[PDB]
Design a binder for this molecule. Sequence first.
Ligand SMILES: Nc1nc2c(ncn2[C@@H]2O[C@H](COP(=O)(O)OP(=O)(O)O)[C@@H](O)[C@H]2O)c(=O)[nH]1
Lengths: 261, 430, 53, 164
Amino acid sequence: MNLDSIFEWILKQPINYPGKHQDSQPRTNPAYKPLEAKAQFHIIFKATGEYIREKMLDGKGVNMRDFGAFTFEIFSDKHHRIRPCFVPDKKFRYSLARYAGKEEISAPKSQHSIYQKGFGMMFCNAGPIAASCYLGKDVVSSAHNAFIQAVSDLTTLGHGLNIDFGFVKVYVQDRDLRYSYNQNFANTLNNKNFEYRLRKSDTPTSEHWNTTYESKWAKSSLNSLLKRPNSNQVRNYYEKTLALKIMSLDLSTAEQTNYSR
Amino acid sequence: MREIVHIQGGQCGNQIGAKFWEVISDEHGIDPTGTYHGDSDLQLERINVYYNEATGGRYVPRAILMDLEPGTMDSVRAGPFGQLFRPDNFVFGQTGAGNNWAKGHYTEGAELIDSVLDVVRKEAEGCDCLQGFQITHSLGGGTGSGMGTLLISKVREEYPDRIMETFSVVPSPKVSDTVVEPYNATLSVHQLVENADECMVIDNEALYDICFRTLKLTTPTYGDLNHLVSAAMSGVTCCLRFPGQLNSDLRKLAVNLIPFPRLHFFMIGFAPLTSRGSQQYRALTVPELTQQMFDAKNMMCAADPRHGRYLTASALFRGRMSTKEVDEQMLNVQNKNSSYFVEWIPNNIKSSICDIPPKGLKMAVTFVGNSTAIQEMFKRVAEQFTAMFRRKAFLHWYTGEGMDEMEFTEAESNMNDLVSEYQQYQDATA
Amino acid sequence: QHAPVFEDSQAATVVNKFQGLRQGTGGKTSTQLPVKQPFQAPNPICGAFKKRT
Amino acid sequence: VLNNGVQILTIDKANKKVKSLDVNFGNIKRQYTCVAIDPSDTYCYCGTKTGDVFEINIERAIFKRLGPVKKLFSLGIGTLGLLPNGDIIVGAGDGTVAKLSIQNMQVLSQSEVLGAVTSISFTGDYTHFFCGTSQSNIYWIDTEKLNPELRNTCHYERINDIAF
Ligand SMILES: Nc1nc2c(ncn2[C@@H]2O[C@H](COP(=O)(O)OP(=O)(O)O)[C@@H](O)[C@H]2O)c(=O)[nH]1
């Protein structure tokens, strides 16, 4: 499994995994042509992989809702040690059979769920991803819900999953699970500039209403994955070909000959 | 037959359900031990609508209680009639939401909701033939306003054909006990208009006003408010449970009351309500019942219905009365108030009769009305929402766990469009 | 190796009309509305014919 | 495209001489008819009378792959075109439209057309292209779903006589 064999495997059976992901969906922006069911699914995963990295660049950590949770540890002491762990969810844990239940993050008894276990846990709202892909919120949620059903594949013998989607490279053996992180990404975490991100009082608390979300989103890393086509050109071609084909039925009629030239 | 199940979430929903179940058990003559102590057969003719039978002859309500904190259900279990509820139906969190819609709709609630959705699916599968689902909740609290509406979406998207209604308690700005009513209220309404087949709004300000002005009792209490709202709730489904000249279930009410999909927000009234000093003086007749029913002050919402034009009205009478006088009174009221009834829907009053009155009363009336006066609630909610939003006040609490301003902007725009489309039909003419 | 560029591949038959945010299934309680189909675990085929390494 | 194989030619403005280099194949003597070029110009895809589409990088004379696996088109490669995504549309002599992604050479969709294909012309935005047969038939073929639709048909050859 190379994160793509999963794509064809899930696309092969629609009855097992019925959803909006199985077929192409119109975009919210007419300037963009539609994608395939398989292609849009890969694009959604690239968008999510970048969304999680830019969230993890801050003190806030992201989790998948049924497939693990991306966290980091703070041992504590112009400066703290940060190390990512990627704990799995309980449903993913049950499917694993030989995976030892070793604890990688330690919390007291009052700290039970991952939301308070992690420092800055995130919902991973699929709204920004849907906006970036110009795709539907419902269909992107359906794609996530369909893909998180990898435990069914895992339960079958063998079938090692090597899923990457960017900085984190995570491998699943028969029942053994391991992971690795990008060395440069890890070094960025130890670049010791996170003292400002950890504290919430660094901002002068004035720009919260001065700065607009459009300005903040323009400088955000997201929305730069896909090139922007020429808006004039796209519907010029669109209505142009539409007229051409809607009245390309007959070639015989001339009504204007131009004999000599 | 054609039974329904109850689900309540949050402190407000739990308090409403506690009194509603007491009222229905009292009306059916069920002892707090679950033992039948009624006097007529009719108290068992249609008991399946709300109660499931167990060995030993006892009954259990088919209600599911959900919350992110255990205190409310721990307190309500000790109250009268508290042993009826099946302890497995209680699902509770260990963290709480702290009146945050994001907390009560995204983080802890979604991982809690698997168990409650599973018990709901067992409850639905067990019963013979579903009729629908009913919810009671308040929009001023984060956990209730989150789990309530998210479960609405889940159950609606799972049983698209069954009817679905909610008693929603909307926060009035006059009596506001928190500082974050507009945010979660608008967010909840954004998807409530999408999924709720029927929504009926209740105002605490209006409850206080009616308690002080009509009953004229010295000390209003949440128990009295629960009693009033529970009587209103039971008046809706009385005819579904008892015989009558013209029965009308929730499906018939919904068919007759909504002209368009996106106008499913209603305001309700109950009669009679007579003051302390005047119970012996007033005479219970159909004209008196109708004139109190159409009184603006008898309303449980602060919206004045004379600021707009009634789209339609529906009345459920309880007791023994000849339908001729009822029809006469409805026609007379409609003729005498042509200014307040929009014209392209002539004869826009539905009437239904159930021959079993409430215990201790000979006649009663329940009212539901679709009118344009409700727009001012949304207008003022949007006003406070944008007033607190233009400075980005308290936005970090929401944005720290999955929220972006795009969702807030979309909800505001959607509710504004809802107001606009609700208001053009007021000015529409034939 | 080689792989097609996934952003540029295009679907023509599907139209570009967008349903928008505004919709409404409330008040649409007709008996003919479609119902969600839950996921089903596939048949376990096991390894009675896999290679033994 | 020489009958023997592929040749790359170099013209220089400095000297009128033309430099010829031959693309070599290991024990392959398939004959080549049509050719198309990657917009990146890194590769060129050439047809064959047998029915498989070979692909050769311009920089090196080696060929990287064979083409469609387990399937041949039975009358050669009449017309060849490329989409912006890299998918190649190929027309067979017997009359057949198929598209191959840049992956294992397996068809995503396949369809048949009357008469031998002779022309494929992609419209602007690369959708819903035009097809011209050897039997004087004009067809319009949608992309990502090969459904043949006849816009206009013409006479084959040599009308001899007309009657009323
Ligand atoms: N009718 C009624 N309303 C209540 C009760 N308790 C609270 N409320 C209303 O609900 C609002 C606060 O709701 P809240 O407790 O935050 O809801 P929760 O977060 O789901 O528990 C207040 O404005 C009250 O007016 C009750 O027992 N009965």
